[PDB]
Amino acid sequence: ASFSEAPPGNPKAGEKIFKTKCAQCHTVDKGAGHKQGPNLNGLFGRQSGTTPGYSYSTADKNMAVIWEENTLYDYLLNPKKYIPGTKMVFPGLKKPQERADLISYLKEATS
Ligand code: HEC
């Protein structure tokens, strides 16, 4: 129900997930620029809506969520429910395991 109770994460599995469901709109490497969505480099611990050069929705700026395992796990279940008014078009990742694997990868990849 929460990150706390979620399955352990496997970054290899998480990579598959990222590639198929997020890569279209997000970069992760420093210097890579933006896509439909902002570059996620250095995501962990940062305030939402603050990456330079990307035009965020007012909601994504106003929420000012500090991204971490906790917040990401809730967010990913249903982004539009988490930040009503966001322009990210993504239904959500329903399974606890899928979220845990994706987060494990992001931790490594966005570093
Ligand atoms: C294009 C169709 C998207 C897909 C697929 C995914 N994301 Fe996304 N993301 C997209 C946009 C246009 C935005 C900005 C939203 C806004 O209201 O401004 C985002 C934003 C994020 C964020 C917030 C980052 C921040 O700096 O605050 C995160 C953490 C994020 N996106 C992650 C993410 C992941 C892990 C996805 C696969 C599950 C994914 N997004 C899909 C566009 C698109």
Curated annotation (Swiss-Prot):
Q: Which InterPro entries match?
A: Cyt_c-like_dom, Cyt_c-like_dom_sf, Cyt_c_1A/1B
Supply the gene name: CC-1
Q: Which domain of life is it from?
A: Eukaryota
Q: List the disulfide bonds.
A: none
Q: Which UniProt keywords apply?
A: Acetylation, Electron transport, Heme, Iron, Metal-binding, Methylation, Mitochondrion, Respiratory chain, Transport
Modifications made to the protein after synthesis: Binds 1 heme c group covalently per subunit.
* Residues with the N-acetylalanine modification: 1
The record lists the organism as Oryza sativa subsp. indica (Rice)
- In which residues is heme c bound? 22, 25-26, 88
Q: Which Pfam families match?
A: Cytochrom_C
Q: What does this protein do?
A: Electron carrier protein. The oxidized form of the cytochrome c heme group can accept an electron from the heme group of the cytochrome c1 subunit of cytochrome reductase. Cytochrome c then transfers this electron to the cytochrome oxidase complex, the final protein carrier in the mitochondrial electron-transport chain.
Q: Which family does it belong to?
A: Belongs to the cytochrome c family.
Q: What protein is this chain from?
A: Cytochrome c
Q: Which PANTHER family match?
A: CYTOCHROME C (PTHR11961)
Alphabetical list of Gene3D superfamilies matching this protein: Cytochrome c-like domain
Q: Where in the cell is it found?
A: Mitochondrion intermembrane space
Report the residues modified as N6,N6,N6-trimethyllysine. Answer: 80, 94
Its taxonomic path starts at: Eukaryota, Viridiplantae, Streptophyta, Embryophyta, Tracheophyta
